[PDB]
Design a protein around this ligand. Structure first.
Ligand SMILES: [Mg+2]
Ligand SMILES: [Mg+2]
Ligand SMILES: [Mg+2]
Ligand SMILES: [Mg+2]
Ligand SMILES: [Mg+2]
Ligand SMILES: [Mg+2]
Ligand SMILES: [Mg+2]
Ligand SMILES: [Mg+2]
Ligand SMILES: [Mg+2]
Ligand SMILES: [Mg+2]
Ligand SMILES: [Mg+2]
Ligand SMILES: [Mg+2]
Ligand SMILES: [Mg+2]
Lengths: 114, 82, 127, 98, 100, 151, 207
RNA sequence: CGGUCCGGCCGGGAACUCAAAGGAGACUGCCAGUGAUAAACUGGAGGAAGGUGGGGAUGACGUCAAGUCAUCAUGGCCCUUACGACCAGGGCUACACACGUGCUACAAUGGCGCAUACAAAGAGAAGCGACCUCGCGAGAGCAAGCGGACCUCAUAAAGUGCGUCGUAGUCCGGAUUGGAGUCUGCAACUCGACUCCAUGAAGUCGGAAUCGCUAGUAAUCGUGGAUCAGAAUGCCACGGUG
C-alpha cells in the first residue's frame, strides 16, 4: 500500500488513508478519489492493484510528499535570505503572521524556559 | 493581500523617482518613506533607503524582492534581547 | 362545532382546534410523529388526553409558531387543556391536579449587563 | 389607496393624534380602516454611565418608535385634501402615501 | 478632544464633501472589470495623489459637543456621556431608561 | 437555604416508562442540556441490560441501583476544633439520587466505547456487585462504619 | 455617585421631554445638535432673564421653542423686538423658520432650575453659601413645595477640602416615580473654582 | 365558507395567532389551624399567576481625600517662535518572561457526511442588498425590493433520521507556517479580517490553589446589535435546548 513514496494505512478508508501522504488533506484526497472513480467508504483492504495505480498517478499530478516539503522549505529559505520582516520572524522563531508575542507565541516560540 | 484586479500598489513619487533613476542609471540611494509600496521589476538594481520610523535603512533591491512591499526589508523595531 | 384553545409555552404560540370523534393529531399540516421526532414532546402533547378519557374520542388540528420543540409541545398541551376546559368545564378538577392548566410562566431570563448571561457572573480574581 | 403611517415616540400622543386624524378622515369623506397598531421599533442603546472605567456600570436606554397605520380606501375630494393642511402636527411624523 | 482635533475633523469632513464625486468616479473606474488596465492604473494614481483627508475612511466620528473619539453613537452623533446627560435632562426625544 | 425551607420541583416522569426515578437518572446523565441524546443513551443501556439480564427493563435497573444505594454516609461537624466525620442515615429520596450519580461517574470513568454501553455495563456490575459505583458505595459504608464511634 | 437623574427616571411617567419631536436615523443627530446650540444661545442670552426649561418642538420643518421664564417682560422687551432678535438667531442656528414662545413661571422659587441659578448667582457675588441655601429653602416652603432639597458641593467659602452641604426641608421622595420631583443643577464658577448646586423640588405627588 | 397554479395566494373573514392602546385580575381578599383575641406564619381552595408571582429600573446618610483635570467643565500653577499647530513615516500590535479575563480544545453525550424540523430578538438608504449568472470558496457581475410586521441581512444551531469512524495523539484537536486568493479602504510590509489548498503544535480533563451558578438558572447551542470603510473569541442584547 505505497503511494507517492510513503506507505499508506491498510485498514483506513481511502479519503482518510490518502491524507497520510504529505501534501494531501481531506479535500485533495476526495478529489483524487473522484479522479480515480472510487467511493470514499472503501478501505485499502479490498482495493485492486489497477485501482491503486490510477490513484497513484492522480496523486503524482499534484506537488506532493517530498517535493512539497522541498518547495515550502525553499520558500522559507528564500524569505530568510531576503531578510524581509517575515524572513526575520522565521529566523527568530517568532510568529510570522502578525500575532501577539507579549503573550501566546508558544507554538513558534517553543515551550517556555524560565 | 492586495487584489489582483486592483493592480499591485506602488507609491507614485517612488515610481517616478525610480523611473528617473533607471533612465539615468546613476545609482545613489533613493530616500523613501512610502514603505507600503510593492517593489517593481524596474526597481531591481537600485538602492532604496526605506524609512523605518527613525532612519532610512538602505535596501539594495534584488530580483527576489519584487512582489514584496518596501517596508518588508526595513525593520521598524530594534529588538535584541531581554 | 370547533371547541378550541390557545396554547403558549416559552416563545411558542400553539393554537389547538379540537373536534369530537376519532383521534388524528395534525401539527402544522404534518403528523405528530412527523413534526415532533422526539418522544417526550409527543408524550407531553398526549398527556392531558391520557389523563382525561380519550382513545378515538376527539381529533385535534393544531398549528404552532415560535420556540423550539419542547416549548412548542408545552404550548400545544396548554392549548389542548384550554380546549378541554371550554368543552366541559368540569375537567378543570383533574387538570388542576395534574398541573396542566398552568401556563408555564418561565421565559428565558434576560441577559444582564455585567453578567455574561442572566445569572452567570464573570470569573472573580480577588487579588 | 390612502396609506397614512404615523411615527412617534410618546404613545399617548400618537393615539390622540391618530384619533384626530381618523376623525378628520371620516367626517370629510368616507371609509377609513381604523388605527392599526404596527410593531414598536425598540432601539436599545447601552452606554457606559461612567466617564472612565467601570464598564459593568451602565445605562440601557431605548427609543420606542410607535407606528400607526390609518389606511383610507375612498378618496373624496374634500377628504383627501384635508389630511395635508388641516391636521396640524405635534411631535409626530406623518407619512401619507397614495 | 482638543480644539485642534475638532478642527482637523472638520477639515476632513469638508475635503470628503469636496472630493466625494471626484474620488468616487475613480473608485468606480478601478472597480470596472470591463475596462482598460492602463486607465485603471491612472485612476489609482490619481486617487493616491488626492488629499487623504478627502477619504471618508480617514474620518473619526467624534462627539459633536465634546469631540470625544470614542463611546460614539450615530443615532445621536454624541459621546455616550453626553447622550446620558441629554437623556437625563429630556433633551433626546423618545429616549428613556429601558427595562425588560 | 438559611430561611427558605422550600418544596422541591416536580419533574416530568420518563416518557417511555412513566418512571420519575428514570427521568431523574437521565437528567443526571445529561450534559449541555442534551436530555434528548442522554435519554436515548439511557434507554439503550436499559435495553442492553434487559437483553443480558432477562428480568425486565426497569426492574433490573432498580435492582442495580439497590446494590449501589448507600444506607449511611459521612458528614462533617467540628464541635471542639478537630475533624469529626459523623455518619448520618441518608434520606431515601437523596439515597437513590446519590447512587445514580455514582453510577454515572463510573460510566464516565469506564474504558468501553459507547456511553450507553458503558452505563449498561455499570448497571450489570451493580446488579452482580463488582463495578465502580458499588466499590464507591462500599468505601462510603466503611467510612461511616469507622466513624460509627461518633453518633 | 449613584443617584439616577430625577427628571430622567420619570421621563415617561410624570415628566415631559424638553426636546419633543420625531426624526429618522439620518437627521436625528443633526436635530439634537441644533437643539443643543439653540439651548446654549438662549442660556447665554437669557442669563439675567430667569429662564428654567427651554422646550423644543419642531413640526413641519419649523422649530417651536417654548421658553419657560420667571421674567417674560425682559425676554419679550417692548412689543417683540427682543423676541424678534432671538427668533432670527434661532432660525440662523437651525436652518428652518423658527418660533419662540415665552411661558411665565409663576412662583419661580418653586422652579428648581431657577432656584439653583439664584443660589449660584449668590455664590458668585460672594455671600455665605449656607445662608443662601437656607433662604432658598425658606422661600420654597413659603411658596408651597411639598418638600425641597438643595445641595451645594466643593470649595465652600474658599475651604481647601471640598465639603458637600445640603438642606432638605419637607418630603422629597426620589424613589417614587409618580412624584413630581422637579430637579436641576447649576455650576457657580467662583474665585475658588466650581461650586455645584443641585436642587430637587417635590412639587407634589401625581396620579 | 367558494376557487384552484395546493403558495394565505385570492374573493373574503373577522374568529384564532399576532400587533399595540385602554382596562379586569393578586390584596394573605376568602376557608382552616398556630399565634396575646394582634401582627403575622403554616396549610387549603379558587385562580394563569400566591403570599414581594418572575425579571428589570429604582442605590438612604455616608464610607474609601476610591476613580476620572484624557468626555466635559473648572481654581491654581506651568508652557506660549513651544509642553501650541500642520504633515509623512513609525509606535501604541515590541517579547527571556509573570498575572487576569475569554475562546477552542483534549473527543464517541464526539467528529465527519448526507437528509430534515423548530426560534426569538434586532439592524438596514454614502445602507441592507433577494432572485439570475460566474466563482470549489471568501466573494464578483447584473440588479429588483425596502427608511422596512411588506424587502433584505437570513438557510438558526444544538436537535432529529440514516450512514460512517471504534478509543488511536485518531477522520479528535485546531495552533503554526508555506502557497494561492477575496474584500474593505489612498494604503493591509510593520499590522486587518475572511477564503481555498497544504501544513496538522501542544493538548488524552489540568499542581498548589480557585471562580461562577438555586430555574427556564447553570451548562450548552446558536442569532443579532452597537462602534465600524474594514477588523470581534470582547461587550450589549435575543431566543433554543435544558
Ligand atoms: Mg497529510
Ligand atoms: Mg441561554
Ligand atoms: Mg478644549
Ligand atoms: Mg475609521
Ligand atoms: Mg446607578
Ligand atoms: Mg423600591
Ligand atoms: Mg501620522
Ligand atoms: Mg493597547
Ligand atoms: Mg451592524
Ligand atoms: Mg477535524
Ligand atoms: Mg504530546
Ligand atoms: Mg440567588
Ligand atoms: Mg464591523
Amino acid at each position: 500500500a505505497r503511494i507517492a513514496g510513503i506507505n499508506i494505512p491498510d485498514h483506513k478508508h481511502a479519503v482518510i488513508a490518502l491524507t497520510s501522504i504529505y501534501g494531501v488533506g481531506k479535500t485533495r484526497s476526495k478529489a483524487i478519489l473522484a479522479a480515480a472513480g472510487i467511493a470514499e467508504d472503501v478501505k485499502i483492504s479490498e482495493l485492486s492493484e489497477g485501482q491503486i495505480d490510477t490513484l497513484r498517478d492522480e496523486v503524482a499530478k499534484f506537488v506532493v510528499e517530498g517535493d512539497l516539503r522541498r518547495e515550502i522549505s525553499m520558500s522559507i529559505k528564500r524569505l530568510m535570505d531576503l531578510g524581509c520582516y517575515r524572513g526575520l520572524r522565521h529566523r527568530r522563531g517568532l510568529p510570522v503572521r502578525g500575532q501577539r508575542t507579549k503573550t501566546n507565541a508558544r507554538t513558534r516560540k517553543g515551550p517556555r524556559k524560565p | 493581500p492586495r487584489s489582483l484586479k486592483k493592480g499591485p500598489f506602488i507609491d507614485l513619487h517612488l515610481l517616478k523617482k525610480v523611473e528617473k533613476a533607471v533612465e539615468s542609471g546613476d545609482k545613489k540611494p533613493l530616500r523613501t518613506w512610502s514603505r507600503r509600496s510593492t517593489i517593481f521589476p524596474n526597481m531591481i538594481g537600485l538602492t532604496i533607503a526605506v524609512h523605518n520610523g527613525r532612519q532610512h535603512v538602505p535596501v539594495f533591491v534584488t530580483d527576489e524582492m519584487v512582489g514584496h512591499k518596501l517596508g518588508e526589508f526595513a525593520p521598524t523595531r530594534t529588538y535584541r534581547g531581554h | 362545532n370547533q371547541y378550541y384553545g390557545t396554547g403558549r409555552r416559552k416563545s411558542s404560540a400553539a393554537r389547538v382546534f379540537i373536534k369530537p370523534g376519532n383521534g388524528k393529531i395534525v401539527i402544522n399540516q404534518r403528523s405528530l410523529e412527523q413534526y415532533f421526532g422526539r418522544e417526550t414532546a409527543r408524550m407531553v402533547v398526549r398527556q392531558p388526553l391520557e389523563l382525561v378519557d380519550m382513545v378515538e374520542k376527539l381529533d385535534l388540528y393544531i398549528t404552532v409558531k415560535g420556540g423550539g420543540i419542547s416549548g412548542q409541545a408545552g404550548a400545544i398541551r396548554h392549548g389542548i387543556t384550554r380546549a378541554l376546559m371550554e368543552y366541559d368545564e368540569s375537567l378543570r378538577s383533574e387538570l388542576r391536579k395534574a398541573g396542566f392548566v398552568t401556563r408555564d410562566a418561565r421565559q428565558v431570563e434576560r441577559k444582564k449587563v455585567g453578567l455574561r448571561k442572566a445569572r452567570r457572573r464573570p470569573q472573580f480574581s480577588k487579588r | 389607496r390612502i396609506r397614512i403611517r404615523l411615527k412617534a415616540f410618546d404613545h399617548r400622543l400618537i393615539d390622540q393624534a391618530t384619533a384626530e386624524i381618523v376623525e378628520t378622515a371620516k367626517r370629510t369623506g368616507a371609509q377609513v380602516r381604523g388605527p392599526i397598531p404596527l410593531p414598536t421599533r425598540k432601539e436599545r442603546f447601552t452606554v457606559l454611565i461612567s466617564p472612565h472605567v467601570n464598564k459593568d456600570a451602565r445605562d440601557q436606554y431605548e427609543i420606542r418608535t410607535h407606528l400607526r397605520l390609518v389606511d383610507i380606501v375612498e378618496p373624496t375630494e374634500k377628504t383627501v385634501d384635508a389630511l395635508m393642511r388641516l391636521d396640524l402636527a405635534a411631535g409626530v411624523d406623518v407619512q401619507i402615501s397614495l | 478632544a482638543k480644539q485642534s482635533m475638532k478642527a482637523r475633523e472638520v477639515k476632513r469632513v469638508a475635503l470628503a464633501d469636496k472630493y466625494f464625486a471626484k474620488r468616487a468616479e475613480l473608485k468606480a473606474i478601478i472597480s470596472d472589470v470591463n475596462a482598460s488596465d492602463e486607465d485603471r492604473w491612472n485612476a489609482v494614481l490619481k486617487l493616491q495623489t488626492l488629499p487623504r483627508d478627502s477619504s471618508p475612511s480617514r474620518q473619526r466620528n467624534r462627539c459633536r459637543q465634546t469631540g470625544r473619539p470614542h463611546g460614539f453613537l450615530r443615532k445621536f452623533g454624541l459621546s455616550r456621556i453626553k447622550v446620558r446627560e441629554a437623556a437625563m435632562r429630556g433633551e433626546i426625544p423618545g429616549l428613556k431608561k429601558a427595562s425588560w | 437555604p438559611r430561611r427558605r425551607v422550600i418544596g422541591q420541583r416536580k419533574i416530568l416522569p420518563d416518557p417511555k416508562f412513566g418512571s420519575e426515578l428514570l427521568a431523574k437518572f437521565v437528567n443526571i446523565l445529561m450534559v449541555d442540556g442534551k436530555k434528548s441524546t442522554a435519554e436515548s443513551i439511557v434507554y439503550s443501556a436499559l435495553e442492553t441490560l434487559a437483553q443480558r439480564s432477562g428480568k425486565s427493563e426497569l426492574e433490573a435497573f432498580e435492582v442495580a441501583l439497590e446494590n449501589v444505594r448507600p444506607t449511611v454516609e459521612v458528614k462533617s461537624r467540628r464541635v471542639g476544633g478537630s475533624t469529626y466525620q459523623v455518619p448520618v442515615e441518608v434520606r431515601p429520596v437523596r439515597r437513590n439520587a446519590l447512587a445514580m450519580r455514582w453510577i454515572v461517574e463510573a460510566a464516565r470513568k469506564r474504558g468501553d466505547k459507547s456511553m450507553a454501553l458503558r452505563l449498561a455495563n455499570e448497571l450489570s456490575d451493580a446488579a452482580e456487585n463488582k463495578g465502580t459505583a458499588v466499590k464507591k458505595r462500599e468505601d462510603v459504608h466503611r467510612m461511616a462504619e469507622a466513624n460509627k464511634a461518633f453518633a | 455617585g449613584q443617584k439616577v437623574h430625577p427628571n430622567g427616571i420619570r421621563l415617561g411617567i410624570v415628566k415631559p421631554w424638553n426636546s419633543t419631536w420625531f426624526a429618522n436615523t439620518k437627521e436625528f443627530a443633526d436635530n439634537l445638535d441644533s437643539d443643543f446650540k439653540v439651548r446654549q444661545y438662549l442660556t447665554k442670552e437669557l442669563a439675567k432673564a430667569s429662564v428654567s426649561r427651554i422646550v423644543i418642538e419642531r413640526p413641519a420643518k419649523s422649530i417651536r421653542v417654548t421658553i419657560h421664564t420667571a421674567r417674560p417682560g425682559i425676554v419679550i422687551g417692548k412689543k417683540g423686538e427682543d423676541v424678534e432678535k432671538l427668533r432670527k438667531v434661532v432660525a440662523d442656528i437651525a436652518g428652518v423658520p423658527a418660533q419662540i414662545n415665552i411661558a411665565e413661571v409663576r412662583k419661580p422659587e418653586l422652579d428648581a432650575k431657577l432656584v439653583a441659578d439664584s443660589i449660584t448667582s449668590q455664590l458668585e457675588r460672594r455671600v455665605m453659601f449656607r445662608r443662601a441655601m437656607k433662604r432658598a429653602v425658606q422661600n420654597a416652603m413659603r411658596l408651597g413645595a411639598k418638600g425641597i432639597k438643595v445641595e451645594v458641593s466643593g470649595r465652600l467659602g474658599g475651604a481647601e477640602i471640598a465639603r458637600t452641604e445640603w438642606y432638605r426641608e419637607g418630603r422629597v421622595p426620589l424613589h417614587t416615580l409618580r412624584a413630581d420631583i422637579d430637579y436641576n443643577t447649576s455650576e457657580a464658577h467662583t474665585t475658588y473654582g466650581v461650586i455645584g448646586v443641585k436642587v430637587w423640588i417635590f412639587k407634589g405627588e401625581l396620579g
